[PDB]
Write a protein that binds this ligand. Structure first.
Ligand SMILES: CC(=O)c1sc(CCOP(=O)(O)OP(=O)(O)O)c(C)[n+]1Cc1cnc(C)nc1N
Ligand SMILES: CC(=O)c1sc(CCOP(=O)(O)OP(=O)(O)O)c(C)[n+]1Cc1cnc(C)nc1N
Ligand SMILES: [Mg+2]
Ligand SMILES: [Mg+2]
Ligand code: NA
Ligand code: NA
Lengths: 544, 544
């Protein structure tokens, strides 16, 4: 009577092994149907997880998780893994607050061998587990599932070199859905049909106990209102994403400046560069999932007179920290960073929240940092960055902004804030996403000033000296960690001016933020409009 | 009458081309002699530069620098490059303050195509220059010299993938001195004799104008008081490097704790692990020049119950920022970081000064940060780190400390500072290298307290509340940038306690520090003993 008679009896991998191999194809058909029925919601990596159903079924049929360790790279392809490991009932609330993560998470289950979200980490983790295993006299199996895209990552390729050097027992499954390792010293098997679960089982049985590292190359298939040219995605009629504002802006700019060259690390759609790549094909570069290569290639362009734009998510820019510091900042090169997904991104959780860029970028000499309040101010920053010396970073959140007409290119002096609401008793300093909350919080409140602190590096020391000298209390708000971010920048400046007003630093706490909506995270962090109103009341302002 | 009749007439590459090819072997003999005579000083990469004399001679004989761009990876092997490009007279003062850099530097000469010091950047820079070249209608040559070691770096391997993808004109010389690229899509030539300058010229002439990227694989030879078991180097009889203190410490510790596993990214000697690798061969790992792999492999060990120790220089830890954040900190893993070369390192200049770790580590949740004042306190921190949950970082400078007897393992509570000199009027907060200056500065001065702020994360909030509440002024000193470091941490804590004393944040300015002794840099930065005395006088303390 049920659509999934086999899955209904499978509560874990030890129930899976009770089936016959001839029943595994029928199980893979149930798993694809289950993934579609429950995970056809918005913003779910449906195609990748569907493509990996057969390899995950065969791995759990052959190996003995949780004693055997199965590692997924990125982790977006492991919905069938979660379904087969006692989390079938939780798939309906995946990525929701209080539910299971969209990626594998060590805290979530003994079956999740690594916490992942960033790509290319599985191989180095697997090597560490294999080395620890041999240092403990144990012989459990270590297996890693890495896609063709993740394999291009630098830390995946380097780890391959070391894995072939140590010669320890481990299995690497290359999940290749885009339709050689002799110098590494690694056993190579394949390519084989990545959707033949019975054939996959046969192979894994006869590979998983061999000596030394092995790569099993499998081939799988990817996925077995108003239009937006930037992201190539249809959006609400009223919507206008920051990614789309950037895409339109840089597409316009490049029409008049042939020095502009846009580099992305395999995120053309997310960063909003679909239209750009078609209008300016001689000025668009995709370096794969290698943020390190994106920034240093841009530096090489800047050395030869170009004005490169690195489009990159805040969380991924973390991968290129040293390239920003060493390859860009030391010679003060003309690299512009347009940083999408700044701040809390929400449902993707701790591995993707970009709440650190105002901290690690700020400590790099010469790197200017700006936060636009709307699309016009984004274009002003982009125009300034593309026409002045040295590196500039422009960070904006995931979300929408007001659409601006073409040809809007204001002139702004970099480093100048702007007062948005009069008032000198309590003054709130906030830029970007935090500024939305601040204006909302102090909307009616007289004497509560609001300043668009749209530049984090440098600060507007003139306005901060004037405001800090006469304000009773200051409130800094940032979609960033409170440690070493915009709040710390204000305190460093005030102290060096020997100004000592009361200051309340509002931001993300020194704690990783689990998956949940950004509105929920900002409410619990204390930066949304009601929480700012609470701080205003603790400071003695009459709040309703 | 002169030892170098040929070199005496060579003031630049256009004079080199006037020679006959039969004179090039004699020139390479002059260049080796010149490098030995002038660069046989202390701490110079003599062997690497000697090994690359023939390839550098042939490249400059064939190419037309500065219009042609020759890129060196790391840059330690390019002494003959500097000699052939008008800097022969400056080799006597190389790495000295006011002299030329030990590596290539764009600011130094039009012949230095990239500023380097960290490894594996040449390939991505070369790709950017080649892309910029083609985007400008120009046809100059782009050539990169990368060693076998640098080629194992992740960003070198990933860049190789993209270089083979773009198919642009460029030459990569693999300088292989440690005695395959079909999937990349790159032309492969070699291996050839890397010391046959005439044969090298012949090849470069017939390769440098071909289409697409080419790899020229050459084979070269590496280098054509009391003993210290840690670094394997003889040192002054009274000396005792921090690297040697760490090596002895972890060698002792691992004898009693089999969970301890030491990972280094190809810096066994510098980190002081020569003896360790011989006493504990089943607990020592070398991952090549891949800091990214070192940290994530350690995370994989920590997931399997081990207590890994990542030994790594502060400047190189910058390469593993995201791996510390994403792979270690998110699940609060038991990874201990022993961070050598913390602070200003001196003669190696801007590419090596480790003055950022107290800033980028501090913004990562759960990462504890300690600064030992001597070897006993280092062992106390190492013992604490290896027996408590979560990640810990321990940073120490290049330099010497007092030698401690074996079996010294004090118990310290992590997060507790210690008052070293009484006094409550002005209190100086300083740890590690900065604490040496502070104790020196306030040695005789009564009422000037000195606190060993040996923990940056967390701060000793109890002592800081007491001291900040009653002190007239505070002075924070750190061998770190003043932006977001220990000074900012103190200000963030004081502000959240609503304590507003006068504070002077002393540290490295928000500017890269050129090559010079650490004593000179600290004097100009304002953290040495006389500069602290100057700050004490500006605060009203009677100073001699
Ligand atoms: C989920 C996410 O954020 C993904 S999934 C993905 C492509 C992976 O390709 P692969 O072949 O490995 O798998 P496939 O798409 O299923 O075929 C990227 C670039 N990203 C973004 C990204 C960017 N950069 C880094 C360091 N990590 C991630 N996860
Ligand atoms: C100079 C310096 O700091 C060197 S030279 C070197 C070995 C390079 O091997 P290669 O084969 O490329 O050249 P060779 O030794 O001459 O044979 C290392 C690891 N380091 C330290 C180091 C560590 N990590 C990084 C990112 N960069 C550097 N420069
Ligand atoms: Mg793929
Ligand atoms: Mg070498
Ligand atoms: Na610029
Ligand atoms: Na620990």
């Amino acid at each position: 009577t049920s659509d999934t008679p086999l899955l209904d009896q499978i509560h874990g991998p030890k129930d899976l092994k009770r089936l016959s191999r001839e029943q595994l194809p029928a199980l893979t058909e149930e798993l694809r149907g289950e993934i579609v029925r429950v995970c056809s919601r918005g913003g779910l990596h449906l195609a990748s997880s569907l493509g990996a159903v057969d390899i995950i079924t065969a791995l759990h049929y052959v190996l003995d998780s949780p004693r055997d360790r199965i590692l997924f790279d990125v982790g977006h392809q492991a919905y069938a893994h979660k379904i087969l490991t006692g989390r079938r009932d939780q798939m309906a609330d995946i990525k929701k607050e209080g539910g299971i993560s969209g990626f594998t998470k060590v805290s979530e289950s003994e079956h999740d061998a690594i916490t992942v979200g960033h790509a290319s980490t599985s191989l180095a983790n697997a090597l560490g587990m294999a080395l620890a295993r041999d240092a403990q006299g144990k012989d459990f199996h270590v297996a890693a599932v890495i896609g063709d895209g993740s394999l291009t990552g630098g830390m995946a390729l380097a780890a391959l070199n070391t894995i072939g050097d140590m010669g320890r027992k481990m299995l690497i499954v290359l999940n290749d859905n885009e339709m050689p390792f002799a110098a590494m010293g690694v056993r190579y098997v394949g390519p084989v049909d990545g959707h033949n679960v019975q054939e996959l089982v046969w192979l894994l049985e006869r590979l998983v106990d061999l000596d030394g590292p092995t790569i099993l190359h499998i081939v799988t298939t990817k996925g077995k209102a108003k239009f937006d040219p930037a992201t190539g995605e249809y959006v609400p009629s009223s919507a206008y994403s920051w990614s789309a504002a950037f895409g339109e802006a840089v597409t316009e700019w490049a029409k008049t400046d042939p020095r502009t060259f846009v580099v992305t690390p395999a995120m053309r759609e997310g960063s909003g560069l679909v239209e750009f790549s078609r209008v300016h094909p001689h000025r668009y570069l995709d370096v794969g999932i290698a943020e390190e290569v994106a920034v240093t290639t841009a530096a090489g362009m800047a050395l030869q007179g170009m004005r490169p734009v690195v489009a990159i998510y805040s969380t991924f820019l973390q991968r290129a920290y040293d390239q920003v510091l060493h390859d860009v900042a030391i010679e003060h090169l003309n690299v512009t960073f347009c940083i999408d997904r700044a701040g809390i991104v929400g449902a993707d959780g701790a591995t993707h929240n970009g709440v650190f860029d105002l901290s690690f970028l700020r400590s790099i000499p010469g790197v200017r940092i700006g936060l636009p309040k709307d699309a016009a101010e984004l274009r002003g920053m982009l125009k300034y960055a593309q026409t002045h010396d040295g590196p500039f970073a422009i960070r904006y959140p995931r979300g929408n902004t007001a659409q601006v007409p073409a040809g809007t290119w204001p002139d702004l002096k970099w480093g100048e804030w702007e007062r948005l609401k009069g008032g000198d008793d309590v003054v709130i300093l906030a830029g970007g996403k935090a500024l939305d909350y601040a204006l909302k919080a102090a909307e009616d409140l007289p004497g509560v000033g609001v300043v668009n602190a749209r530049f984090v590096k440098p600060l507007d020391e003139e306005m901060l000296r004037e405001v800090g000298g006469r304000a009773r209390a200051l409130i800094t708000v940032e979609d960033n960690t409170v440690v070493g971010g915009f709040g710390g920048a204000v305190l460093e400046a005030l102290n060096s001016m020997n100004l000592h007003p009361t200051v309340r630093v509002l931001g993300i706490p020194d704690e990783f933020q689990e998956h949940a909506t950004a509105e929920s995270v900002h409410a619990r962090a204390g930066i949304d409009a009601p929480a700012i109103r609470t701080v205003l009341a603790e400071l003695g302002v009459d709040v309703p």
